């Protein structure tokens, strides 16, 4: 397949793809669109795309798994507080 991304910029901020070796680098660049293919080009046209986008990125895929972890702790705690009836008569 062929890769395709949307931001392949430099200037590492959170998760941009390009990183220089030395941190205060003199060179920077940006590709506001991108599609590149090697080793299987046919008929002078790209194949199916392999996007960089993803339903999940590794920031949202730890934060979900901890939020979904302590939602479950809450719904055990909330289940018990939602289940203490009082008595009807007093003597």
């Amino acid at each position: 397949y062929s890769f395709h991304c949307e931001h392949v910029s430099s200037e590492n901020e959170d998760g941009n793809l390009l990183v220089p070796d030395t941190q205060p680098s003199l060179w920077q660049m940006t590709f506001r669109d991108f599609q590149i293919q090697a080793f299987n080009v046919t008929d002078k046209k790209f194949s199916y795309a392999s996007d960089c986008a993803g339903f999940f990125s590794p920031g949202i895929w730890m934060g979900l798994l901890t939020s979904l972890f302590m939602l479950f702790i809450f719904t055990y705690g909330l289940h018990m507080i939602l289940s203490l009836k009082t008595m009807d008569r007093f003597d």
């Binding site: 289940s83 009836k85 009082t86 008595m87 009807d88 008569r89 007093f90 003597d91």
Partner: protein, 336 residues
């Protein structure tokens, strides 16, 4: 799985009714009361047990014993939250049914509500729902008042115009008890687990006593075979087949051979102790077996049916003593 809960709500009350089980008079406790000779000596040995100092202030032994098991039962109902408070309400319906038939009789014969307080069982009582206290109307404008009482859903087989002397006084108790036993079985089937195998064997035999004792007294009576068919509770082991052959019985041996299909109910027909003294010892054999299982609601209903055996046995000891006929004094039920 339904046992690591149930101590959230019913932890304390379970250990309470187990503690009240130890107050039941044992076999050695029964032997010393046979050796008594007067009611004053009967008062002395009962002060050694848990009952003590209850006669500080022979038919007074009937009332002062059974008033103790009412306040012990009322104290348990004051602390059960919601999984059990309806269950203890089901035990009171057997006493509310015997109360309400006592009430429609004086209603039919214009005997007012002044006789209600001293002549009814305090377990199933009417000290709330004050509409029933005012009603003197002859059994037709009182049924509209009767439905403001938890016996309303059992009156769905009781037509209001059928109440006015077309049905006998005794017949309406059994078809109300028929409606009572189907609901309490289905309520104990909705609850599952340990309270569904320790309680429903008790309700099967209780429905089968109402299979046998009905047809054995329905011989000389002028109630037909279709009447005793619908007075059988459709609940126990005898449901698809044994209820059919009991309708065509007409004879004492013809109810025996239909009990010979079950090895539990035969060897109980060898009373030939009478039959009801043999049905009672099997009943307290089942209520004692309910005390084995721990995390279940059947320990309360097994306590009440044994506590009524305690008030039954002491009076039978007292009646053989006061009338001085203690050659049949050993014919009690030694439950523990």
């Amino acid at each position: 799985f339904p046992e690591l809960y149930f101590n959230v709500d019913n932890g304390y009350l379970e250990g309470l009714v187990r503690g009240l089980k130890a107050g039941v008079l044992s076999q050695a406790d029964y032997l010393n009361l046979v050796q008594c000779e007067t009611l004053e000596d009967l008062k002395l040995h009962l002060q050694s047990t848990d009952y003590g100092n209850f006669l500080a202030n022979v038919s007074v032994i009937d009332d002062r014993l059974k008033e103790k098991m009412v306040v012990e039962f009322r104290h348990m109902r004051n602390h059960a939250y919601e999984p059990l408070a309806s269950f203890l309400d089901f035990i009171t319906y057997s006493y509310m049914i015997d109360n309400v038939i006592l009430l429609i009789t004086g209603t039919l014969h214009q005997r007012s509500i002044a006789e209600l307080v001293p002549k009814c069982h305090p377990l199933g009582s009417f000290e709330q729902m004050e509409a029933v206290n005012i009603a003197q109307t002859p059994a037709e404008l009182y049924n509209a008042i009767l439905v403001d009482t938890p016996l309303a859903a059992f009156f769905q087989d009781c037509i209001s115009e059928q109440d006015l002397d077309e049905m006998n006084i005794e017949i309406i108790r059994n078809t109300l008890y028929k409606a009572y036993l189907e609901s309490f079985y289905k309520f104990c089937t909705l609850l599952g687990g340990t309270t569904a195998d320790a309680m429903c064997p008790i309700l099967e035999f209780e429905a089968d006593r109402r299979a046998f004792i009905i047809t054995i007294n329905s011989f000389g009576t002028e109630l037909s075979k279709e009447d005793r068919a619908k007075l059988f509770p459709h609940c126990g082991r005898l449901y698809p087949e044994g209820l059919a052959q009991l309708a065509r019985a007409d004879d004492y041996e013809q109810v025996k051979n239909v009990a010979d299909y079950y090895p539990e109910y035969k060897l109980l027909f060898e009373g030939a102790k009478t039959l009801e003294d043999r049905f009672f010892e099997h009943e307290v054999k089942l209520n004692k077996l309910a005390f084995l299982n721990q995390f279940h609601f059947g320990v309360f209903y097994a306590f009440v049916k044994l506590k009524e055996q305690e008030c039954r046995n002491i009076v039978w000891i007292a009646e053989c003593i006061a009338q001085r006929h203690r050659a049949k004094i050993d014919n009690y039920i030694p439950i523990f």
